Ligand SMILES: O=C(O)Cc1cc(CC(=O)O)cc(-c2ccccc2)c1
Ligand SMILES: O=C(O)Cc1cc(CC(=O)O)cc(-c2ccccc2)c1
């Protein structure tokens with residue numbers, strides 16, 4: 001293995017030879033440990049509170065999930081405890097027959113995914129435009145510097161030679177250029193999967209990339225119309241740790257559809273950075289803090305460019321195999337068989353594959369499957385064998401499906417069908433309200449002015465206006481936050497990193513206008529394009545469901561908060577100062 005990772009280690013060794021040592025009391029058991037060097041401690045056990053959001057959500061000061069979220073350990077200590085739990089494990093190798101089905105399926109799936117599209121290289125200008133639009137920190141400074149691009153070019157020349165010298169994953173500009181240069185080279189070779197929407201619903205049938213949270217529920221409702229069994233949504237315990245060498249070799253098959261110059265660069269990314277990796281991990285010691293240099297041949301690097309698309313791909317493949325087992329196409333004898341006949345797998349893929357893909361909604365490790373009947377619940381031999389062991393359930397207990405698409409969990413959410421006063425139906429995203437309020441009350445990082453804090457608060461309030469307007473508490477808090485923040489202040493910083501976020505709330509444009517555009521105008525499931533002229537016509541969940549999903553409506557503390565919210569708004573305003581404010585409270589029935 002040192003023939004592939006050695007050059008990278010040699011450069012880390014030399015760059016930090018002042019503090020380089022082999023700590024013989026390191027915790028790594030499955031990962032290969034190379035050495036350590038001293039560093040300053042990064043992250044805290046707590047997180048900065050958004051005072052604007054906190055001031056306008058007083059009843060949630062006494063809510064356990066809200067308090068819990070105000071913590072989250074990002075220190076070298078917290079990073080080490082989470083590591084040994086899942087990261088430091090080995091997945092048993094799938095059986096020869098299972099490996100054969102996976103290979104047949106992967107081949108078929110890559111050819112289906114590339115039927116209309118062709119792989120291509122992504123560019124310096126695409127990555128530059130991306131780093132610009134996302135920042136508008138030290139990434140934009142590197143992108144604007146020609147010396148960064150000269151180093152990228154040097155690293156690329158090693159890749160074309162089949163060598164790597166600076167592509168290191170993490171769990172000032174010297175190493176920062178080597179990291180951002182590694183991410184650019186990965187984007188150049190594999191970015192087309194994201195950039196050209198290989199996992200969009202139209203291209204992949206199962207995929208949902210580029211659809212958006214507001215479309216996921218409509219997608220789940222459409223799957224529920226397909227005849228078959230219950231809807232299954234099993235979670236895998238630590239998906240990224242369960243990605244085997246066999247999975248990596250099946251994902252690699254996309255290189256076969258590439259142009260020679262592209263194939264050469266993607267093959268270098270796969271073989272030198274996915275199938276062989278050098279990882280930097282922060283660890284505390286009695287002498288201080290160190291950065292450990294570790295390596296392994298399998299698992300997925302969680303923050304990489306290809307990660308989402310490749311997990312979506314491998315999950316679609318795994319779910320097709322489980323459907324095949326559910327249908328009796330694959331038996332126990334077949335999975336053990338090193339000479340299993342391809343014919344029946346190919347036959348099933350060629351005649352039923354696409355129809356079977358349409359029964360699923362897959363986003364990385366998140367899946368929803370509506371098989372042709374419920375034999376799927378007990379079809380576990382292949383799923384467990386492939387290494388995709390389901391979370392918090394005995395390996396062999398049958399899965400439990402849902403007979404109502406509204407009860408189905410997907411991408412940290414569930415979805416409700418709402419009937420508007422005008423009789424039109426909406427399908428909306430929802431989740432427990434404490435998770436929503438608890439996140440909104442946290443400001444990412446430290447050293448933030450009341451200005452930046454108020455704008456992030458406005459960002460969260462406008463996100464709730466567009467996605468979670470059907471929650472009474474969130475509509476009230478959203479109107480209170482927007483009443484307290486000056487009108488012309490542009491929401492800055494993101495509310496979420498979700499690939500399902502289109503950030504339509506990052507504007508000073510009227511939120512009812514934006515709501516109309518998302519839910520009425522551009523909504524393919526909204527046949528009647530009549531606009532909603534008032535927030536009073538934007539529906540709420542029924543009171544009961546609002547309560548079942550964490551609402552405080554009906555509580556005295558909540559009625560006291562609602563009645564006295566203009567006072568709290570006025571307090572934030574007096575602290576912000578002499579700015580122009582709009583009172584958004586009259587857009588509500590209450591005021
Ligand atoms: O990132 C977070 O803090 C929580 C979170 C999670 C998810 C689900 C997932 O991507 O895993 C989705 C969204 C989201 C919200 C509004 C619009 C679009 C997406 C937010
Ligand atoms: O049900 C509706 O359509 C109208 C509606 C709106 C609101 C939002 C607001 O807080 O002003 C709250 C409540 C509510 C119900 C029971 C107890 C406490 C509040 C009802």
Ligand SMILES: [Zn+2]
Pocket residue numbers: 155159163164165166167182
């Ligand atoms: Zn490299």
Ligand SMILES: [Zn+2]
Pocket residue numbers: 414416430431545549
């Ligand atoms: Zn709900």
